[PDB]
Design a protein around this motif. Structure first.
Motif, PDB file in Angstrom:
ATOM      1  N   UNK A 120       0.870  -1.198   0.000  1.00  0.00           N
ATOM      2  CA  UNK A 120       0.000   0.000   0.000  1.00  0.00           C
ATOM      3  C   UNK A 120       0.898   1.236   0.000  1.00  0.00           C
ATOM      4  N   UNK A 121       0.844   2.002  -1.074  1.00  0.00           N
ATOM      5  CA  UNK A 121       1.690   3.180  -1.226  1.00  0.00           C
ATOM      6  C   UNK A 121       0.878   4.473  -1.257  1.00  0.00           C
ATOM      7  N   UNK A 122      -0.423   4.354  -1.480  1.00  0.00           N
ATOM      8  CA  UNK A 122      -1.311   5.518  -1.445  1.00  0.00           C
ATOM      9  C   UNK A 122      -2.714   5.116  -1.028  1.00  0.00           C
ATOM     10  N   UNK A 123      -3.346   5.987  -0.257  1.00  0.00           N
ATOM     11  CA  UNK A 123      -4.723   5.813   0.144  1.00  0.00           C
ATOM     12  C   UNK A 123      -5.453   7.142   0.076  1.00  0.00           C
ATOM     13  N   UNK A 124      -6.632   7.117  -0.514  1.00  0.00           N
ATOM     14  CA  UNK A 124      -7.481   8.304  -0.583  1.00  0.00           C
ATOM     15  C   UNK A 124      -7.955   8.697   0.814  1.00  0.00           C
ATOM     16  N   UNK A 125      -8.196   9.986   1.021  1.00  0.00           N
ATOM     17  CA  UNK A 125      -8.495  10.514   2.354  1.00  0.00           C
ATOM     18  C   UNK A 125      -9.801   9.959   2.897  1.00  0.00           C
ATOM     19  N   UNK A 126     -10.684   9.573   1.988  1.00  0.00           N
ATOM     20  CA  UNK A 126     -11.979   8.997   2.338  1.00  0.00           C
ATOM     21  C   UNK A 126     -11.839   7.757   3.224  1.00  0.00           C
ATOM     22  N   UNK A 127     -10.671   7.122   3.177  1.00  0.00           N
ATOM     23  CA  UNK A 127     -10.455   5.859   3.871  1.00  0.00           C
ATOM     24  C   UNK A 127     -10.617   6.007   5.390  1.00  0.00           C
ATOM     25  N   UNK A 128     -10.334   7.197   5.916  1.00  0.00           N
ATOM     26  CA  UNK A 128     -10.505   7.463   7.345  1.00  0.00           C
ATOM     27  C   UNK A 128     -11.928   7.136   7.792  1.00  0.00           C
ATOM     28  N   UNK A 129     -12.883   7.415   6.918  1.00  0.00           N
ATOM     29  CA  UNK A 129     -14.285   7.176   7.220  1.00  0.00           C
ATOM     30  C   UNK A 129     -14.734   5.805   6.721  1.00  0.00           C
ATOM     31  N   UNK A 130     -13.961   5.213   5.817  1.00  0.00           N
ATOM     32  CA  UNK A 130     -14.349   3.941   5.216  1.00  0.00           C
ATOM     33  C   UNK A 130     -13.744   2.746   5.954  1.00  0.00           C
ATOM     34  N   UNK A 131     -12.424   2.728   6.074  1.00  0.00           N
ATOM     35  CA  UNK A 131     -11.720   1.587   6.656  1.00  0.00           C
ATOM     36  C   UNK A 131     -11.257   1.923   8.079  1.00  0.00           C
ATOM     37  N   UNK A 132     -11.449   3.173   8.462  1.00  0.00           N
ATOM     38  CA  UNK A 132     -11.087   3.614   9.796  1.00  0.00           C
ATOM     39  C   UNK A 132      -9.626   3.999   9.965  1.00  0.00           C
ATOM     40  N   UNK A 133      -8.734   3.506   9.109  1.00  0.00           N
ATOM     41  CA  UNK A 133      -7.326   3.844   9.244  1.00  0.00           C
ATOM     42  C   UNK A 133      -7.049   5.210   8.637  1.00  0.00           C
ATOM     43  N   UNK A 134      -5.789   5.594   8.648  1.00  0.00           N
ATOM     44  CA  UNK A 134      -5.351   6.835   8.040  1.00  0.00           C
ATOM     45  C   UNK A 134      -4.709   6.507   6.692  1.00  0.00           C
ATOM     46  N   UNK A 135      -4.792   7.396   5.689  1.00  0.00           N
ATOM     47  CA  UNK A 135      -4.115   7.187   4.403  1.00  0.00           C
ATOM     48  C   UNK A 135      -2.635   6.868   4.598  1.00  0.00           C
ATOM     49  N   UNK A 136      -2.026   7.584   5.534  1.00  0.00           N
ATOM     50  CA  UNK A 136      -0.604   7.456   5.834  1.00  0.00           C
ATOM     51  C   UNK A 136      -0.359   6.244   6.719  1.00  0.00           C
ATOM     52  N   UNK A 137      -1.443   5.708   7.249  1.00  0.00           N
ATOM     53  CA  UNK A 137      -1.388   4.511   8.069  1.00  0.00           C
ATOM     54  C   UNK A 137      -1.260   3.283   7.187  1.00  0.00           C
ATOM     55  N   UNK A 138      -1.897   3.319   6.025  1.00  0.00           N
ATOM     56  CA  UNK A 138      -1.804   2.206   5.095  1.00  0.00           C
ATOM     57  C   UNK A 138      -0.586   2.344   4.198  1.00  0.00           C
ATOM     58  N   UNK A 139      -0.352   3.557   3.685  1.00  0.00           N
ATOM     59  CA  UNK A 139       0.742   3.782   2.758  1.00  0.00           C
ATOM     60  C   UNK A 139       2.091   3.528   3.438  1.00  0.00           C
ATOM     61  N   UNK A 140       2.549   2.301   3.296  1.00  0.00           N
ATOM     62  CA  UNK A 140       3.822   1.897   3.840  1.00  0.00           C
ATOM     63  C   UNK A 140       3.731   0.620   4.656  1.00  0.00           C
ATOM     64  N   UNK A 141       2.630  -0.115   4.513  1.00  0.00           N
ATOM     65  CA  UNK A 141       2.467  -1.377   5.224  1.00  0.00           C
ATOM     66  C   UNK A 141       1.946  -2.437   4.269  1.00  0.00           C
ATOM     67  N   UNK A 142       2.149  -3.700   4.611  1.00  0.00           N
ATOM     68  CA  UNK A 142       1.719  -4.806   3.772  1.00  0.00           C
ATOM     69  C   UNK A 142       0.205  -4.976   3.815  1.00  0.00           C
ATOM     70  N   UNK A 143      -0.411  -4.873   2.645  1.00  0.00           N
ATOM     71  CA  UNK A 143      -1.841  -5.070   2.488  1.00  0.00           C
ATOM     72  C   UNK A 143      -2.279  -6.402   3.045  1.00  0.00           C
ATOM     73  N   UNK A 144      -1.662  -7.478   2.546  1.00  0.00           N
ATOM     74  CA  UNK A 144      -2.112  -8.862   2.781  1.00  0.00           C
ATOM     75  C   UNK A 144      -2.522  -9.178   4.227  1.00  0.00           C
TER      76      UNK A 144
END
Length: 114
Positions: free
Chosen positions: A18-42
């Motif tokens: 995960x290298x980029x996440x749209x800001x909407x994700x805060x409300x969708x997946x609960x995490x932060x865009x910067x929380x995902x961008x830099x961690x293993x998706x799987x």
């Protein structure tokens, strides 16, 4: 049609962690865009449906494009939201290597738990 819909742009790189996440994700997946961008998706990337996504990665790795439907995506607290992935691999023009992964996520069902 007239549809707002819950859709957030996403990007991965090669291994598709995960290298980029749209800001909407805060409300969708609960995490932060910067929380995902830099961690293993799987990890959070679907519990039982990650195999489905493995098939997606397996397909997308040498098709340049992939489609996939309702899967369970892990929400911040271990939740599951049903989504679909419009997938594409953006390759480097000068390197022809997997430059990035372009994912379009469609939030169908909201937080399902247990």
């Amino acid at each position: 049609g007239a549809m707002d819909s819950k859709t957030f742009l996403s990007r991965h790189s090669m291994d598709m962690k995960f290298t980029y996440c749209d800001d909407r994700i805060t409300e969708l997946i609960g995490y932060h865009p910067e929380e995902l961008l830099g961690r293993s998706a799987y990890e959070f990337y679907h519990a039982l449906d990650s195999e489905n996504m493995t098939k997606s990665h397996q397909n997308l790795c040498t098709k340049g494009q992939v489609v996939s439907g309702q899967y369970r995506m892990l929400a911040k607290h271990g939740g599951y939201v049903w989504l679909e992935t419009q997938g594409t691999v953006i390759y480097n023009p000068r390197n022809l290597q997997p430059q990035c992964i372009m994912c379009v996520n469609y939030v169908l069902s909201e937080i399902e738990k247990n």
